[PDB]
Amino acid sequence: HLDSLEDQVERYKQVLDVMPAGVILLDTQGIVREANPEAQRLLDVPLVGEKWYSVIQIAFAPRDDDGHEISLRNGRKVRLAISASTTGQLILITDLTETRLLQSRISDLQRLSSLGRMVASLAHQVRTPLSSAMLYAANLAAPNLPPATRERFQSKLVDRLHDLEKQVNDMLLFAK
Amino acid sequence: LDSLEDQVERYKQVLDVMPAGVILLDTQGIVREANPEAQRLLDVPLVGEKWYSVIQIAFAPRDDDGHEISLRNGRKVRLAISASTTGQLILITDLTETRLLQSRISDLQRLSSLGRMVASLAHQVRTPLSSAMLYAANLAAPNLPPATRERFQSKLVDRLHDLEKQVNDMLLFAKGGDNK
C-alpha cells in the first residue's frame, strides 16, 4: 500500500515526540524546519522558522570548560552530534546537564573525603598488625612452653601492640 | 506524492545514528524493529524474538534498581513505555554513567561522615586496645598463679576481637557500596 508509508512515517514522528534526545532538521539553506519537544525543551527558544546560526547566538553561550559539550545560555550543558545528510543536515542533542552537575560535586567532596579516606586507609592497615597480633596471642596458649619461651612471644606481642597503637593513634589523631 | 520517500530516508537515518535505543513491539509482544543503539545496549539478538524472551536473557533486574533496570552486562538503562497503534514503543537510554556518579557522591559523603565520627570512634577503639596491652604487660613476670595467668590469656583474645569487630565496622561503613 502507498498509504502504509504515511502510517510508517507516523510511527516515526511518534518516536521524535517521546524521543529523549533533540532532533534538529535543517535544510540546504540552513533553516530549522523541524524540532521535537526535547529540542524545544533544552534550547527553550523559537526553533522552527529560524536560522540555525541565529539560534546559536541566543540559546548558546560557549565557555572554555566546554569540551565535547556546549554550554547553553539557559544553563544546560549539551553535546551536539552532526551527521552527513543531503537536503539539510541532522543535529542530535543530548542532555548532559546532570552529568557535569554531578561531576562538579565529586571534586569538592573529593577533598572533603580526604581526612575520612585517610582514616579508612589507616583502618585497613590495622588488619595486618592485628592479624599477626592474634597469632602471637594464640602462641601464649600453646602447650609445654618453657618460662623463657612465654616471654619470647610476649616480647613479639608488645611489638605488634606498639606497631598497632601507633597506627590507631595516627588514626585517632585526626579529631574534632 | 513523493514527499514521503524523501521524508522516510530522512527519519530512517535519525534512528540509525540515534544515541538512544528504539524497540517497537506488537500486541502479542514480538520484536519487529530495533535500531543499532538498542542492539549495542542489549547485545543479544533482537530482530525476530519474543520481547519476554529477551527480557529474561537481556535484562537482569535488581533491588537496588530504582527507576532504571540493570542489564546482563551490568549497565543500567531506563525504559520509557509509550502507547502505539502497533503494540508498544519502548525507548532505551543509558544512565550507567549517571548512576556511577550518583554512587561516587554517596561514597564521598560516606567517607566524610567517617571523618566526622573519628572523634566518637576513639573511645570505642582505644578501650579494647588499652586492655590488650594492660594484660599483655602483666604476662611478663618471673612466676605467678597459672589459673590467673590463663584468666588474663582469655581476656586478650576477647579484647582483640572487640577491636577487630570495631575496626571492621569502620571499613564496612567506609567501603560504602550503596546507592549504585
Author numbering:
A (entry chain B): 12 to 187
B (entry chain A): 13 to 192
Sentences from the paper on this structure:
FlrB is a histidine kinase that phosphorylates FlrC, which activates Class III promoters. FlrB is a histidine kinase with a conserved dimerization and histidine phosphotransfer domain (DHp; aa 125-191) and catalytic and ATP binding domain (CA; aa 234–340). FlrC is phosphorylated at D54 within its receiver domain by histidine kinase FlrB, and the FlrC central domain forms a heptamer with ATPase activity that catalyzes σ54-dependent transcription. Our results demonstrate that the PAS domain controls FlrB activity and class III flagellar gene expression, and FlrB must switch between inactive and active forms in order for V. cholerae to successfully colonize the intestine.
Interestingly, although full-length FlrB was subjected to crystallization, crystals contained only FlrB aa 12–192 in the longest fragment (chain E). Three residues of the expression tag (Ser-Asn-Ala) and the first 11 N-terminal residues were disordered, and the C-terminus, including the catalytic domain CA (aa 193–351), was missing, likely due to peptide hydrolysis during crystallization. In the crystals, the FlrB12-192 fragments form an asymmetric dimer in which the two chains adopt different conformations; this can be seen if the PAS domains in each chain are superimposed. The extended helical DHp region forms two alternative kinks in the alpha helix at residue 130 in chain A and residue 125 in chain B, causing the two DHp regions to extend in opposite directions in this superimposition. This asymmetric fold has not been observed in dimer structures of other histidine kinases (HKs). The structure of the PAS domain is in good agreement (r.m.s.d. = 0.759 Å) with a further truncated FlrB PAS domain structure (aa 8–123) that was previously reported. FlrB PAS is a member of cluster 125 of identified PAS clusters across all domains of life. Members of this cluster have substituted Fα and Gβ elements of the prototypical PAS structure with a unique short loop region. For example, L36 is in close proximity to R22 on the opposite monomer; the substitution of phenylalanine (L36F) may lead to a cation-π interaction that causes conformational changes between PAS and the N-terminus of the opposite monomer. H135 is C-terminal to the kink in the alpha helix in the FlrB1-192 crystal structure.
